Symmetry: C3
Subunit: 430 residues, 3 copies
């Protein structure tokens, strides 16, 4: 833990020093450095570098102005290495990619790409890290969802270093599955010589199963570089204090930060805020109920958000652009989990699925129909297993949210209970 | 459109002139002519004529009095032909039958007739135009529901002009089905020589399918004759202005009309009003949600309506009868559709049917169970097709309600969302 | 009825005289005699007698004190016989056992015992009278649930008087089943020579079926002995007035009684009250909706009750114990039923399970999916039968609740509509 917090603390400290350096280069005011659109361009530039540029937004005579500029990749690559105490520091780079991955996950549906891969577009909840490059970091692998891994595997299916890269991705997917049955099917896809349609059919099956028997997918609060830099500048030592991606730290940092955003004419700044909050705590595919309870205010579905993406395109004119504060704080916090929830055990039950009439009164007599009727080769084992699962089943027994002052997660608050962020479009009402 | 509005405008103009004529014959006051019970008798008389009579209600010394009278069928038949500029005018007649059909559809469940035909009594939503005579008009055919057509077909199954009338009804049903699979099954029932139990079994199957893969059934706002007549009298020219059954016109006319009803001691006039509003816009089997949103006030299920039928029987005594205004106006309007909604296409999906846990918090993990589990000869094609359908699926993408001033349907309002009018009795709570 | 009310009135009159006698022996004040914990010990002592003792709670110098004492079984057995006018009076004894059975049914989940018997722990609603001894009274047999009978039958399966006791329990279970198919399966378990796994598998099947096709299980309001005794003492004659266990009498008696309870530091007295009210009217496995409507205030699930059991263990210290009034009255009353609801008939339907679109408006088009899709050896007959059942189906047509003044059940009030008491734990949210 101390050792982990030490290295994490270093890479966040690196990103910070880099951002401050980059902010002085461009001669940006502190406020300007803390504009989200400016942070994303600077983040983009260091990622492309490993000519490079993008739009940078300044404040001249009461109006927001765009001014795209370019740098040498070598100059940036030099500035990054040196902000990270000599080392090449690839870890801090994939941390900015995962942040971009998370914001993409909240902003865009990847339906157009799912159909090409022959996948059900209703698998979006399985698509964490889909806009993340194949062969990302170890951190990138961890964050990638079951569906993402399946999609990457099909692209391959559809040069003996190709076979090892195939087996690598199979093992990444296998390690994510929490049941033996699901894992044995991955062995049958990996062990296959010259993969084709059978493996395609198998991976589509496995994806569907992961909607019920969920895979272990890592979640990491990753913040725009301007949040870290602003903290390094203001006198916070990430190396002496350490840092966590899954503990309280990102929540605490956001509670001590103020980021800004460019907002368009018709857009609701509160809705823009939800989007960046969701991305910040990797929450695109969380239950809206749990997000809402943590944040304090309601977390509304994508289709009910009166907002477009964070990035302002080259097309649109700056004259109508205004700048708003992003509300990125929370009521409570919670530990970010690697778990997909309970998949097996099946240790007893405890519950009630029907009633026995005591009073002679006119009424319907409720019963849990799917569950009662349910109880009446590896695919067969999988089907039977996911037929046993009920939406009513509770995962993460005992674990709860925490107050912002409870840094050591001493006193968990267990909450009393629309769930899907992407279940509200012109074709479906979920 | 202009040509259609021209003929529609003429037949509504005919009905108007007829009603005014009939109102002067009976020496009725304007108010009395606009009593719904009086309109229904006059409507009945011209339909029977093609001795004939019924109850007529007057206002003598502060009390409502019933006074049944009879006319020569020939005299009525003469009065109808002449109000319709010489022509026999059968179209205007079937328009009054469809109005009666719609009021029946809202007033009575046809369960007793469904059981005799060997049909599930839960098919009421398929029963538009069931009280409409076999071999009605072309308009009558259009308005008749899938279930109605099936019921008529069984009565036949249970004289070579019998075979053509059989094939006619098959084609009416076929034209209503929006899938190839459903249509090919109708060919197999029609092509059959000497129909029997196989065809009975096939048509029962087809009826069940039409609850999910819905048929194209026409909907026509048809108003009591007293509404049209009152407009002709007050100076409205249906021929110069044209008229529509599916556009704004009936809504606009109702917004400029005042009809009355006889109300019994225990009855809620507001509930009586809902019933006649439902009948007026052919809405017996609509989603109560959409009816409520259009009308402005809640549209309550039949079992929660403290009202009986519009017609006051010969048995009941007039001394307790009072007269109320029927509230037949709306907040908005909407185009009446021929469509049954989306049945096929299956072009991608876009949506979310599960969640991925981000926070370590005690909770259930929702998922759309029927949908996920779903994906695991013409009857087989039909079953597979209706197993793909979800109640969550959206039909009529882009189309919405309109303000009463938007005559050209320029600006659609898409609404934000109990659905069944007949799902609230002593045996079922739907 | 008069004859039944006569004998019931006698046994309740016996229990009363016994309790008063026992209260004078222990030199208890009236208030103390009406403390629920004191009533349960006295009840326990007469049941064990047929050395015996338990805790008795007094009020000394502003503090509650525990003082366990013992009696001769023979002395108690003498006191019971004589309070019941000479007779041995076993009936009044099983009435106190059924009361304890009901309080257990409300207090404890029997999941740990269900798993040992190889039964689904979600069958709790079938477990009325599980803590009641095998071979109880005839009254005890009636009150025992389908699941209880199955559990007892397995214990047997897992000395030719063993065979008759086996056949006896089979007949008790058979008489409870409301369908022929379920009854014929019980014949196949009973007729079996040397029972084993086939019978185990059959009885588990039968238990599952009874969640949908419910068995006829008796329900009896049985009150703590202190309620009866307090009424005998205050001048009520149960023998002249008669008494009922299923009519108005227990409701009326509770409305004229005041019982007390020992309450722990953290406990909500209102929640303690719900628990004893539930036990009093045998309502552990009723729909919470109907319980709430009758009682007047909400009847909360077990997991949301901030209370533990009624009995205060020898471990816990009395110094923190305070005494509260138990709120055991109701808004209305209802007849306690022997019926499990409608299981067959299938006489038509009457209802609506889909809609037909009238307006061209963007929306989902609801339909009852399970019901529509449903319609597409004795076990097979059972499966098909329970596949026809819908949670929406109405049982007890016409029957309703009554005002406390309507003793003759003249005017039934039919109510307008969380259902499970045990569907709210750390593993399931039902
Ligand atoms: C930014 C931040 C990020 C994370 Br992850 C957690 N904690 C954070 N802060 C740091 C600043 N902070 C203060 O109260 C301070 C400090 C201060 C400075 C550093 C450490 C502690 C303290 Cl207390 N020095 O002056 C004031 C005033 C609030 C908590
Ligand atoms: C009855 C009605 C049915 C339908 Br379908 C649509 N529109 C309708 N009306 C007609 C009457 N109306 C008026 O404002 C008028 C008119 C008037 C008369 C005819 C046409 C237009 C007008 Cl504007 N002449 O005087 C006043 C006053 C309201 C709208
Ligand atoms: C206890 C009780 C249980 C059941 Br089961 C039903 N009814 C019950 N009571 C009895 C007492 N009670 C009274 O009003 C009385 C009576 C009285 C006493 C006995 C009978 C009737 C009456 Cl009215 N004698 O004085 C007053 C005062 C209320 C109703």
């Amino acid at each position: 833990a101390t050792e982990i917090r030490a290295s994490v603390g270093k890479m966040i400290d690196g990103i910070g020093r880099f951002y401050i350096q980059m902010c002085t280069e461009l001669k940006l005011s502190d406020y300007e450095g803390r504009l989200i659109q400016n942070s994303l361009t600077i983040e983009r530039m260091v990622l492309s570098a490993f000519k490079t540029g993008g739009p940078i937004y300044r404040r001249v005579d009461g109006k927001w102005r765009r001014e795209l500029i370019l740098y040498d990749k070598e100059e940036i690559r030099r500035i990054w290495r040196q902000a990270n105490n000599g080392d090449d520091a690839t870890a801090g780079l994939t941390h900015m990619m995962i942040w971009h991955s998370n914001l993409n996950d909240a902003t865009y549906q990847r339906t157009r790409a799912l159909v090409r891969t022959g996948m059900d577009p209703r698998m979006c909840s399985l698509m964490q890290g889909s806009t993340l490059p194949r062969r990302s970091g170890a951190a990138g692998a961890a964050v990638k969802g079951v569906g993402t891994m399946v999609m990457e595997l099909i692209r391959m299916i559809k040069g003996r270093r190709t076979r090892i890269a195939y087996e690598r991705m199979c093992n990444i997917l296998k390690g994510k599955f929490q049941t033996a049955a699901q894992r044995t099917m991955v062995d049958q896809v990996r062990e296959s010589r010259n993969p084709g349609n059978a493996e395609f059919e198998d991976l589509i099956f496995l994806a569907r199963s992961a909607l019920i028997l969920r895979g272990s997918v890592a979640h990491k609060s990753c913040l725009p570089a301007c949040v870290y830099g602003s903290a390094v500048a203001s006198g916070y030592d990430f190396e002496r204090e350490g840092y966590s991606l899954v503990g309280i730290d990102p929540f605490r940092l956001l509670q001590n930060s103020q980021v800004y955003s460019l907002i368009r004419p018709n857009e609701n700044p509160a809705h823009k805020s939800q989007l960046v909050w969701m991305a910040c705590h990797s929450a695109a595919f969380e239950d809206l109920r749990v997000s809402s309870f943590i944040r304090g205010t309601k977390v509304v579905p994508r289709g009910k958000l009166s907002t477009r993406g964070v990035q302002i395109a080259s097309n649109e004119n700056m004259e109508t652009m205004e700048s708003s504060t992003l509300e990125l704080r929370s009521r409570y916090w919670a530990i970010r989990t690697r778990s997909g929830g309970n998949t097996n055990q099946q240790r007893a039950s405890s519950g009630q699925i029907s009633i026995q009439p005591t009073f002679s009164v006119q009424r319907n007599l409720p019963f849990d129909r799917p569950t009662i009727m349910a109880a009446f080769d590896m695919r067969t084992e999988i089907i039977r297993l996911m037929e046993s699962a009920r939406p009513e089943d509770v995962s993460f027994q005992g674990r709860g949210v925490f107050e912002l002052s409870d840094e050591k997660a001493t006193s968990p608050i267990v909450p009393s209970f629309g769930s899907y962020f992407f279940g509200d479009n012109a074709e479906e009402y979920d």
